[PDB]
Amino acid sequence: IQETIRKL
Amino acid sequence: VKIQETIRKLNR
Amino acid sequence: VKIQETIRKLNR
Amino acid sequence: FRYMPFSPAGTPFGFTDRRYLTMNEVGYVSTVKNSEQYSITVSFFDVGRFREYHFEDLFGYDLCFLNEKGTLFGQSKTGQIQYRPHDSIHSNWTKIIPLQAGERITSVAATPVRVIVGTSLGYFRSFNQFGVPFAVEKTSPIVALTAQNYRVFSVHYSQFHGLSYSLSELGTSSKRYYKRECPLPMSLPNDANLDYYNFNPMGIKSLFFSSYGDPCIFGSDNTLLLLSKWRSPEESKWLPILDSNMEIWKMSGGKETTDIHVWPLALAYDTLNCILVKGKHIWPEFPLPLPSEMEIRMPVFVKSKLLEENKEIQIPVSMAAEEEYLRSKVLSELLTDTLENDGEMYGNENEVLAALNGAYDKALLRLFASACSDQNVEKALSLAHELKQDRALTAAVKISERAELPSLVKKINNIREARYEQQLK
Amino acid sequence: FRYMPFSPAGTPFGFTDRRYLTMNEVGYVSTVKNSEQYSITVSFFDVGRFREYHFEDLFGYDLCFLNEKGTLFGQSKTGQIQYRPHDSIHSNWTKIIPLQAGERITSVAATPVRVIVGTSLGYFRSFNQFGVPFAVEKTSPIVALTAQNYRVFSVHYSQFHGLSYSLSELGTSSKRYYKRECPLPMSLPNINSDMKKDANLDYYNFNPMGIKSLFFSSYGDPCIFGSDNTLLLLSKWRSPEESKWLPILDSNMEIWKMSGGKETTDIHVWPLALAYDTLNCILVKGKHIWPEFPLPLPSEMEIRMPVFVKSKLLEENKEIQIPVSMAAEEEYLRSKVLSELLTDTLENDGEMYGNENEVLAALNGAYDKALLRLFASACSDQNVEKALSLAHELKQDRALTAAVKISERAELPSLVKKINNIREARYEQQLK
Amino acid sequence: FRYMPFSPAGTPFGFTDRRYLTMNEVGYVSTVKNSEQYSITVSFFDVGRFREYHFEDLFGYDLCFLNEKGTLFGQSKTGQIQYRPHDSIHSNWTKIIPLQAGERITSVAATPVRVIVGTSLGYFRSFNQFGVPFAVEKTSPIVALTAQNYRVFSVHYSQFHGLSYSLSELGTSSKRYYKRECPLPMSLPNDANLDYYNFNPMGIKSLFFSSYGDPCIFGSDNTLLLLSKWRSPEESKWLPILDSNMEIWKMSGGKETTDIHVWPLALAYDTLNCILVKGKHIWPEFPLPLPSEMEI
């Protein structure tokens, strides 16, 4: 989930 | 059956 | 009995 | 908010000098403005049993409740009540209820063994049929009261919870609550009938125990609500069992009327003894018509679907069997609870429940046949699980054989075998 | 809604610089504004037992509760409490109650063995007499607390359920509920637009609920005294399905009877405690409904069942003379209620003072004696049915014999035979 | 107050011609305005387990519920419902609910064994997975419904004390209430997202049972509330076990991102299956991104 917020 | 007759009389 | 006397005095 | 004096099936004066105080299956009590006093008339439907009489009211009674043994009257403002037994053997007695500043008597009720008075401050004063007080209780503000034998159905109101109800039993020892201020999901009113809703703000046209001892209420939404499973507090449900507006619609040939209304008196098993009112107003007039009998119907009928089948309102057998299944299931479940805890009260409950369970399976087997007609094996098996009598399970097997569904036959026989193996334990 | 710091029988400052924190049968706790601090004075009615003392309050205590062994103080805003035992054996201890954003302590209570603190968020923090904390509980927002020995009577409020009450016991391990958040049918105040200049508006701003006081009775039954000046006692609280709130005293009606039927606008009752059948109170004369300084001596008002009608009392008088026929109905009802409560008390808790069995004995005696007066008036009016129903409610068999002799004197032989049937039926049920 | 048709994790039309009916851990159901009718599409997240399908909606359903066995549809005004099992072995069935004057279906729900319909007047009509009616019950006006096995979690609205919740088991014996219209401690709603709060005035984004049998609710305050110890009415407590506002802030380095929003699907023991929305609108649009999991 930490990678999803980074790309957003 | 008596109520259906009563509403039919009261209907029109 | 004492309370009825007190109320009589407070009205008076 | 202003509490109004309530009585079962009471009517307002309107533009007349007379109205009905109370009204139920026993008779009707009317009052007529007489210059400065009132003329109260107590009438009965079974004219053979009791004799209609009348007396002069020097107090202005606006509260009344009628049972088979006597009549109870009450004054909402002065707090004076009077119990007049129907027979002349027993004497009339009169008491005056203490009322505080702005306290009004909102409802009264009486049984052959109890007399109940409820106030707007929440005072619950109970007496025996002779005027001997038992105990004074403080509850929520009471708006409606009805009673049967030793049990009381009270409707309360506040600014917080809204409308709540309590169900209690006034035993010989002490008072016991079955339900204490639980939610009452009766629809509140939302005009030509403005005179009525000022006389009855809640719209409670009447409330009463059923003939078998189940609490009922009839709000302004003209829907008969029965309290199911009130002996088990965690299973209590209010069940809509009659949409009187829908019935009049079905008997009137699908025509929307604005002149036919229902006035509830009591519920006898499956029949709603009522008064059919014709006119602009929703409350009955003088003279009072003869009581009518409306069979209860589960609100499962759709107007649009009924119009298509007719092209009196003809009901499709597939839909009428589904309604008969629900109606039997509800009535059977209630009457069984009655016989398992309180026993009998009229002498025909055991025979009624027997024929009731029969109509349950018969209507349920009709649905099972239509499921086999549509090759719906899954829906048919679920229907078979709900069957009561083992003879009905055998009948379902033969229906499956005529429909040539051998896969269904084997699964139903598993149910028959499982019930036969529970019989061995 | 805004929760206010509550204490039993507390009075507001009003337009003065002093008020009463709490007040009951033991004594009274007052506080005076002293420039920037406060001067708290703890006084007692039994001057022989305890010695009146006073101390300087640098915190501004607005919460207090008094028992026979110590005094509890509390600050609604900072969350600081202090328990000061009367005796020098144990030292005073002070704790600070955790309070969240806007959380206020709404009521405090203390017994010789328990200390209870209630907040506006519904936190129920309990301790022993030394400050050892118990489990912390989350309930409905608390507005009023009272306790007696190991039992707690709590009043909760919400915008949903309204006014509820809980009755619990603080055991050695954890808290056990006799009743949890049942309806509390106490009458709420009715404030008008002319009350915005009324002299007693300050009280209902200081106590919105109108709970003038609440307490356990001398025999351990919960009581409450709302703004309607009616003493409500909780009957059958050990059996949940039988719980009843019984109005046992209309103090406004009593004052009306003591004043000779004249409506007064200057006499009010301030409740302290209930001793068996007597309400210890303070008779306040003046414009305000709460006592001011100096405090009068406590008065004693016997409880009377609200069955008296003003109109009937005025006609019978033409002190307020009460007709014996109507007074016997009240004495029957009152005895029935008191007997029923004391019987439940002795069957579960035993005795607590040593003479309860003697009290219940004379209580049941006055029950039948007053009930026989109703039976006599029924026979005087030839009402055989009403008399027979009255006889069924008789307790002692020796009371049934008295009813037989009364029926013989009234020349009602049919009734005599029916009363003796009760004796036979009661002998039959005793053997089966 | 306006009784708006509710479904778990539903999205409004906005200015587009398509929206989502319902949405949970099983999948997402969307409907598109056509020339005259609608086009409903039922998709799944485990594409290797359920067959996606679509049909033409001649009735214009605005209510939906999705379980692991079928999809329940509903029309709030005509009172028409329809259950479509995921497997073609079971037949689709259709039934019309009786609705009085101004009575609207507000919420529907389904399990493998039960089908629930609730109205704005307080009617509680329950059926089995084949349409056979079991009981018609009158309660407070219903605004939100969800179910699991035999349990049912209903949100009611009263004119007086406002929102309330009920919890009950529809066992084969008889319906048993654990909680009966108790207070709902949810935060009511306080603009670009004004289209949503008209489609859902009560701000209940979604509600469901946890994988261990506890009711959950996700308000406009974006806090997952959990009802713990509901079998014991004395110890019943609502626990805010997840504040999605904090978790987004902590994973953005510490910068207040106003383009990130959470859309709840379900609660699988330890993780919150949800949809992370990027845009000015707090509701997800098309195409639907991959489901995320937020720890508790």
Residue numbers in the entry:
A (entry chain F): 504 to 511
B (entry chain D), C (entry chain E): 502 to 513
D (entry chain A): 474 to 663, 671 to 791, 814 to 927
E (entry chain B): 474 to 791, 814 to 927
F (entry chain C): 474 to 663, 671 to 776
Task: Pull text from the paper.
Ctf4 forms a homotrimer that has the potential to connect the CMG helicase to one or two Pol α complexes, via the α-helical bundle at the carboxyl terminus of each Ctf4 protomer, which binds to a short conserved motif in the GINS component of CMG and the Pol1 catalytic subunit of Pol α (Simon et al., 2014). Crystallographic analysis classifies CIP-boxes into two related groups that target different sites on Ctf4.
As Tof2 had not previously been shown to interact with components of the chromosome replication machinery, we expressed a tagged form of Tof2 in budding yeast cells and found that Tof2 co-purified with Ctf4 in both G1-phase and S phase. To validate these findings, we used the crystal structure to generate the ctf4-3E allele, by glutamate mutation of three key hydrophobic residues at the interface between Ctf4 and the Tof2 CIP-box. Critically, the ctf4-3E mutations abolished interaction with full-length Tof2 in the yeast two-hybrid assay, without affecting interaction with Dna2 and Pol1. Conversely, Ctf4-4E (with mutated binding site for type I CIP-boxes) was still able to interact with both Tof2 and Dpb2, despite being unable to interact with Dna2 and Pol1. These findings indicate that both Tof2 and Dpb2 are archetypal “type II CIP-box proteins”, with a distinct binding site on Ctf4 to the type I CIP-boxes of factors such as Dna2, Pol1, and Sld5.
